[PDB]
Every structure is written in C-alpha cells, then in structure tokens.
Paper text:
Further, the in vitro assay confirmed that NasF5053 could produce NAS-C (47.4%), Asp-A (44.4%), as well as a minor product NAS-B (8.2%) (trace I). NasF5053 adopts the prism-like fold characteristic for P450s, consisting of a large domain of 10-helices (C-L) and a small domain of four α-helices (A, B, B’, and K’) and three β-sheets (strands β1-1 to 4, β2-1 to 2, and β3-1 to 2). Our systematic mutagenesis studies on the promiscuous NasF5053 and the versatile NascB identified four key resides, Q65, A86, S284, and V288, which play critical roles in controlling product regio-configurations and stereo-configurations. To obtain insights into the structural basis for regio-specificity, stereo-specificity, and chemical versatility, we further determined high-resolution crystal structures of wild-type NasF5053 in its substrate-free and substrate-bound form, and of two NasF5053 mutants (Q65I-A86G and S284A-V288A) in their substrate-bound forms.
Comparisons among the three substrate-bound structures showed that all substrate-interacting residues, the heme, and the two substrates superimpose well (RMSD in this region between any two structures <0.26 Å), except for the mutated residues and the adjacent residues such as K289 and I87. The plotting of the spectral variation as a function of cWL-PL concentration is fitting to a rectangular hyperbola curve, yielding a binding constant of 11.6 ± 2.1 µM for the interaction between cWL-PL and wild-type NasF5053, 25.6 ± 1.0 µM for cWL-PL with NasF5053-Q65I-A86G and 4.81 ± 0.26 µM for cWL-PL with NasF5053-S284A-V288A. The mutations of S284-V288 regulate regio-selectivity and stereo-selectivity by adjusting the relative positions of the two substrates and their conformations. Given that S284 and V288 contribute to lining the binding pocket for cWL-PL-E, mutations to less bulky Ala residues create space for cWL-PL-E to move towards the heme. This movement disturbs the interactions with the cWL-PL-U radical, and in turn pushes away the DKP and propyl rings of cWL-PL-U towards αI (orange sticks in Fig. 4b). MD also shows that the probability of the C2-N10 distance in the wild-type protein being >4 Å or <4 Å is almost equal, which means that native NasF5053 could catalyze the formation of the products either requiring or escaping intramolecular cyclization. In the S284-V288 mutant, however, this distance is fixed between 3.0 and 3.5 Å, making intramolecular cyclization inevitable.
Residue numbers in the entry: 3 to 217, 221 to 398
The structure:
Amino acid sequence: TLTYPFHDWSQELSPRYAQLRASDAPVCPVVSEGTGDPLWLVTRYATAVKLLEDSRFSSEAAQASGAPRQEPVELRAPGTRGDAIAMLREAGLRSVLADGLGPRAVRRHQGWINDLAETLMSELASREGTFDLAADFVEPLSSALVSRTLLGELSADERDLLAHCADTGLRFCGVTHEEQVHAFTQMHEFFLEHARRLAGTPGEHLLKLIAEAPVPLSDEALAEAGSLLVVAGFPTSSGFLCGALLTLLRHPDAVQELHAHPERVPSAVEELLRYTPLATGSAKRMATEDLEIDGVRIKAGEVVMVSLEAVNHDPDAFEDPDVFRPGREGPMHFGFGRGRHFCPGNRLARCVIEATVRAVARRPGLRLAVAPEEISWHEGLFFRRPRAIPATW
Ligand code: HEM
Ligand SMILES: O=C1N[C@@H](Cc2c[nH]c3ccccc23)C(=O)N2CCC[C@@H]12
Ligand SMILES: O=C1N[C@@H](Cc2c[nH]c3ccccc23)C(=O)N2CCC[C@@H]12
Ligand code: NA
C-alpha cells in the first residue's frame, strides 16, 4: 500500500526509510506512484550487500524497456536502447572506460580541477556581499568537469540545454510525461548532431576516447554514450557537490578540523559520500529467476530497489548514522553503490569533491547567508539539488 518515492526532496530523509528498516521484513513491498508497478524495497545494509553482490539480480533487466519501475517515464529516447554503459562494455571498451575514468584520468585532470576550485572560491571571497554557491561555484565546476573530462567543450547554451534535459527527464514529478520523454529525445538528437564534433576536438575527454576506439560505433551508439555521460555525470555531480557544501557549512567544527589537519580531508570526502543524500529514488535490480533474499521469495521478473541513502543511514552499520563524523571508521559506504555496478565515475567524483572540500577548508568562516530551512529545493529530481545556496564570509 505504501507508494514510492517518499517525496523527501530536501536533505531531510523521509522517516519511512527508518520505519521500513526497523520493520520485521528485510524486504518490503511498495507501489510505484508513477506507474502503479509493485516493487520491493531494501533499506538495510546487510541485505543490500547480499542483493547488489548477487548477479542473478540484474541491473540491465531492471533498466530495460517494459520493466516494472519506479520512474514515471522510460529513461531513454523512444526508439533507442538506453543501455549505453552495457553497450560500451559490450563492444569491448572496458579498457577505454578505465583510461578515461580511472586513476590516469584523475592524474591528467586533478591539476586544473583544483586550480578552478580555488579560482572560483577566490573570486567569491573577493566579492562584497553574498553569493550563490550553486550558480557561482558548483555549476562552473561541474560544467567544466563534464566538458573537459566527459563530452568535450560545450558552449554555455549547450551546457544549459543538456542540464535542462537532464533536470526534466530525471524526475519523479513536476513535468508532464510527454515533456519528460521529449527531454530524452532532445538530448539524443543533440548528440546525433554534435557527438562526432565534440569527440573530434582536442583533449582526452572520454567521448573522444570512445569514438576513436577500435571495435565503427554508429552515430546512434555514440549519441547514447553522450546521453549516458550527461545523465550519469552531470546532475549527480552538481547535486552532490551542492549537498556536500550544505553539509560542510552546517558543520563548522568539522571544517575547522580540516583546516588545521588537511590530511584528514579524504576521510571527510568519504563521510560526505555516506552522509549527504543524493538520489530520491533507489538503485534497483530485476530477479532473473526465482530468488530468495533473507527468507523472502522474489519471483523472476520482480524488481528489488535498494535505497542507498537508507543503507548509508543504517544504525546497524554506522553508529549514530545521522551524525556527520569524518573518520568514523565503520564499513564501506554505499554512496557509489556496491558490486559490479559500482560507480565508474567514482575517481573523478572523488577528485572534484576533494577539490571542493579543500577549497572550503582553506577558507574558514564561509557560512550560509540564510537558515538551512530557508533553502529552496528543486522538487521531484532524482538527484537532490537546491535552487540556490546563499553564502558569505
Ligand atoms: C559525482 C557524484 C556521483 C555519485 C554520487 C555517483 C553515484 C553512482 C552510483 C551510486 C551508481 C550505482 C547505481 C546502481 O547501483 O545502479 C553509479 C553508477 C554510474 N555512474 Fe556514478 N556517480 C557520480 C558521478 C559520476 C560521474 C562523474 C560519472 C561519469 C562521468 C558517473 C558514471 C556512472 C555510470 C556510467 C554508472 C552506471 C554503472 C552501471 O550501471 O554499471 N558517475 N553512480
Ligand atoms: O548506466 C546506467 N545504470 C543504471 C543506474 C544509473 C546510473 N546513473 C544514473 C542516472 C540516472 C538514472 C539511473 C542511473 C540505470 O538505471 N541507468 C539509466 C540511465 C543510466 C543507466
Ligand atoms: O533515484 C534514482 N537512482 C538511480 C540509482 C542511484 C542511486 N543513487 C545514485 C546516485 C547517482 C547515480 C545513480 C544513483 C536509479 O537507478 N534510478 C531509476 C529511476 C530513479 C533513479
Ligand atoms: Na551484477
């Protein structure tokens, strides 16, 4: 009877997640508000490990057109596959994905990412008055990450178009179904027209590595790779960096510790990934056969969701789970997932989060110019994001 998701669009997690977690079942039935599909929902760390490390629960099967699902419209342009990352690994591009997303990419890019973070923060510090950390720090930094490491250099109008498509398509509510579908169409048509151009510009952005890779990727396939990098890399990084700055600004003692002890910043990055919520939906997998999870039978074809926010706030895994405690020394967080589908963007994500944390830690006194309650949130996004983050020294 419980409908999903829980409309917890700000950083305050829905109390439903703790209620289910403490329930007597390790897996609980819900219904998709957007489709009426019955779904299963996992909220406990121990059960989540088991689900996401069992390859008979398939991610691709849960993404496929026609699967039971939490999202109101399919997350693809009509007529296209929608499984880009599978398709690129499919065509033998694991090596390419590693060179473009792995440690060597971070080594190529970490210099300018930290230069840009400081330059942005320095300019804001030079301002008389308040400023907006979302529009004035996160947007330029996340846009530069997308252009330089993922797609190739975008104009401001192209960045805005891709951001709008992602915000419109990656939603539970607040737009009509047809608008959502059309956002995916527009984004596909943008890369049908522009992916080869972007791939051909100088740089080592991933889309170039993909387009130049031996396998002849079609325009449609290269367009799907472009769309994947937007949906997976852009609203995620923007939303998270926004949420992480909010967390830091609400924990000046933690920031002061990092200012005095910069060697502690990596531990703080990992705690932000646990503590700061991002997705308002759930990672999900389809039972490819009849399966059982901690005693509950899951029939073939049924989809099991795991809320990574719920798992990350599981008190059986993390003591005082709702406390931001850098260095807490508990189990691995789920902010990048678990198992085979662990976020491949995790190296670049950690790079940009770390650069942001260090930029903040170097400048104590940075604070919200309004109360946390006065922050306004985009309602219905998959990936939480505030409308603005008024801030000042
Ligand atoms: C910056 C913050 C980011 C966060 C918090 C994050 C988080 C995640 C998580 C939790 C998943 C797993 C979803 C699942 O289990 O089904 C995932 C998957 C993925 N991420 Fe990230 N991500 C971020 C950034 C990025 C970036 C920058 C890229 C690439 C440029 C990226 C590329 C991907 C891809 C392609 C997948 C799909 C993996 C698969 O389904 O096999 N992510 N991400
Ligand atoms: O590569 C994928 N993986 C999963 C999880 C995911 C990772 N990043 C996402 C961004 C938005 C929605 C889902 C995800 C998925 O649902 N996918 C549909 C869009 C991208 C595709
Ligand atoms: O809210 C969602 N989360 C991702 C998984 C994910 C969980 N946490 C993430 C963080 C970054 C990227 C993806 C994820 C997913 O598969 N979805 C299908 C529709 C809703 C959407
Ligand atoms: Na798997």
